[PDB]
Design an enzyme around this catalytic site. Sequence first.
Site, PDB file in Angstrom:
ATOM      1  N   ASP A 133       0.573   1.109  -3.468  1.00  0.00           N
ATOM      2  CA  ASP A 133       0.604   2.010  -4.645  1.00  0.00           C
ATOM      3  C   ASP A 133       1.984   2.705  -4.674  1.00  0.00           C
ATOM      4  OD1 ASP A 133       0.090   3.762  -6.699  1.00  0.00           O
ATOM      5  OD2 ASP A 133      -1.765   4.522  -5.876  1.00  0.00           O
ATOM      6  N   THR A 134       2.890   2.179  -5.475  1.00  0.00           N
ATOM      7  CA  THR A 134       4.273   2.715  -5.623  1.00  0.00           C
ATOM      8  C   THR A 134       4.189   3.998  -6.418  1.00  0.00           C
ATOM      9  OG1 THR A 134       4.745   1.480  -7.616  1.00  0.00           O
ATOM     10  CG2 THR A 134       5.374   0.478  -5.421  1.00  0.00           C
ATOM     11  N   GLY A 135       3.079   4.226  -7.119  1.00  0.00           N
ATOM     12  CA  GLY A 135       2.867   5.487  -7.799  1.00  0.00           C
ATOM     13  C   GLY A 135       2.355   6.613  -6.905  1.00  0.00           C
TER      14      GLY A 135
END
Lengths: 99, 99
Positions: free
Chosen positions: B25-27
């Site tokens: 999850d780059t968010g």
Amino acid sequence: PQITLWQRPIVTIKVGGQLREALIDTGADDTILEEINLPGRWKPKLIGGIGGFIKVRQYDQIPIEICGHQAIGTVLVGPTPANVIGRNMLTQIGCTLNF
Amino acid sequence: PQITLWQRPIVTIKVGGQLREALIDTGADDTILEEINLPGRWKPKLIGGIGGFIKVRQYDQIPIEICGHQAIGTVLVGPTPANVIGRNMLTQIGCTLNF
């Protein structure tokens, strides 16, 4: 481009004749923008919330530009803490994770 | 590895002598796991919620293994819809976004 993850991966996008900041979010199925007037037909969609659902407008086949790459896809419009580019749009620009 | 985003980027991780599924999850700033007994000292931490805060336990300098790459970093433990690998751990394994 190659984007590292020391900072939030926030990019300049072009959508609906506007410039927006948006987060590249591999954890998001869908692309959601804060309120913007998009062209075309929309249908309502329920997305998940802190104890409940959020109603948003679903626009299909919207042109975006992410770091100079064009991508057609679904954009959701409504209440969001940020513009989020989710997987539906990242596939279109050939975005992979790499290590 | 190179991971494409047609599906959710869910990987097998090794943490606390257990095997877990987790979303890349780059968010997400932070790495959060569902309830697991981790070794060492923890301090409480407030993270953001649907109209409120969630209290979680913060463990520093925890060994993880993501697709065979070791990475030391902070892991949060508490209520989460999924194991999430956030940016604090992705930098450690040299994870980039590429297009």
